[PDB]
């Protein structure tokens, strides 16, 4: 009761006359609603990565993923090719998240230096051709080919990034070719000043039973959220609830508030609303178009008035800055305390 709350907050068994601040009241959400875009087609992953010989190490191919529903439990359960070390992603929350413009790439490497050429760390191939940002949103997956995908007859297959003068521009291939340049002018015809071809030195034999394994790598790019999302996770969507402090999950924008009609003159491209204080007060439906307002439900402070413990135990409660009708005591269904 208010007397017990005041005694607890005052750390005493006796309370003198006066008014005291104890805690605050708020309205808890009664339900949750999810509004998500509807996508019929399933997102192609096995047919875009699990395939024949991948792109060259120097010239890696980029595959694009958009307008699809992507599930990652299939790759989680699919066989060896383990690792999947997400730098800034929870590995179990990919399905929940709805992504934007996922870009797929094909890599081929030796495998003996995968640890050093791993993204986020400097390595031989990393300093040769491919550079990655300090923290890319995507995840790196190494496909450890054990027996079948390892070539045992072809001595070349896919070449190796043998040499490169310096690291290339960010997110660029290594189409660079021709002969090595010696210190005293570039050499001519190998025999001049020991020209070395900067590639073709993959050279793994079947007798090379101890030298690495094919470690094909895929890297994705996502997490923009400024534009409307394209690749959305496989989650159900339910009907929206208006004029209620409800848990909304509009296209991943999870939050609690009272949803009401909005008169905002949203331009056709504009998707999200905001206010002065960097708060999304409006939202656009990822379903049938409807501009919707966002407003958190009521809350305020609670003050306790007592005439003194010795005088009486009768107390009075003042609710701060709230109209009486909107917040009576007979609404104790989701109110605090």
């Amino acid at each position: 009761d208010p007397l017990s709350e005041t005694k607890c907050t005052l750390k005493s068994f006796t309370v003198e006359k006066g008014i005291y601040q104890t805690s605050n009241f708020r309205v808890q959400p009664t339900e949750s609603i999810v509004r998500f875009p509807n996508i019929t087609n399933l997102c192609p992953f096995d047919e875009v990565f699990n395939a024949t010989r991948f792109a060259s190490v120097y010239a890696w191919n980029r595959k694009r993923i958009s307008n699809c529903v992507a599930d990652y439990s299939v790759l989680y359960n699919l066989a060896p090719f383990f690792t999947f070390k997400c730098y800034g992603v929870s590995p179990t929350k990919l399905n929940d998240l709805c992504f934007t413009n996922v870009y797929a790439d094909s890599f081929v490497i030796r495998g003996d230096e995968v640890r050093q050429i791993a993204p986020g760390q400097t390595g031989n191939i990393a300093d040769y051709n491919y550079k990655l940002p300090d923290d890319f949103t995507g995840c790196v997956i190494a496909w450890n080919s054990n027996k079948l995908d390892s070539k045992v007859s072809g001595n070349y297959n896919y070449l190796y990034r043998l040499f490169r003068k310096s690291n290339l521009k960010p997110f660029e291939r290594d189409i660079s070719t021709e002969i090595y340049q010696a210190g005293n002018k570039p050499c001519n015809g190998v025999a001049g000043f020991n020209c070395y071809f900067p590639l073709k030195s993959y050279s793994f034999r079947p007798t090379y039973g101890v030298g690495h394994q094919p470690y094909r790598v895929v890297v994705l790019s996502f997490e923009l959220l400024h534009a409307p999302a394209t690749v959305c996770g496989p989650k159900k969507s339910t009907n929206l609830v208006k004029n209620k402090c409800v848990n909304f999950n509009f296209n991943g924008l999870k939050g609690t508030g009272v949803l009401t009609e909005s008169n905002k003159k949203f331009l056709p491209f504009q998707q999200f609303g905001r206010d002065i204080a960097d708060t999304t007060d409006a939202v656009r439906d990822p379903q049938t178009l409807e501009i919707l307002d966002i407003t958190p439900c009521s809350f305020g402070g609670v003050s306790v008035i007592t005439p003194g413990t010795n005088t009486s135990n009768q107390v009075a409660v003042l609710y701060q800055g709230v109209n009486c009708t909107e917040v009576p005591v007979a609404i104790h269904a989701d109110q605090l305390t």
């Binding site: 009401t260 206010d275 002065i276 204080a277 708060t279 307002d293 407003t295 958190p296 009521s298 809350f299 305020g300 402070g301 701060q320 800055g321 709230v322 109209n323 909107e326």
Partner: protein, 43 residues
């Protein structure tokens, strides 16, 4: 009239709150009304 350019707001009943006081209020920044009113002060 001269000083009423900036004020507390003259309303704290939240009924009109659905745009400056409300933005701060939604971040839990309240204003408590003074004990004495202008009528008493003028008296």
């Amino acid at each position: 009239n001269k000083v009423t350019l900036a004020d507390a707001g003259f309303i704290k009943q939240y009924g009109d709150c659905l745009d400056l006081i409300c933005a701060q209020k939604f971040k839990g920044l309240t204003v408590l009304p003074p004990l004495l009113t202008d009528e008493m002060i003028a008296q």
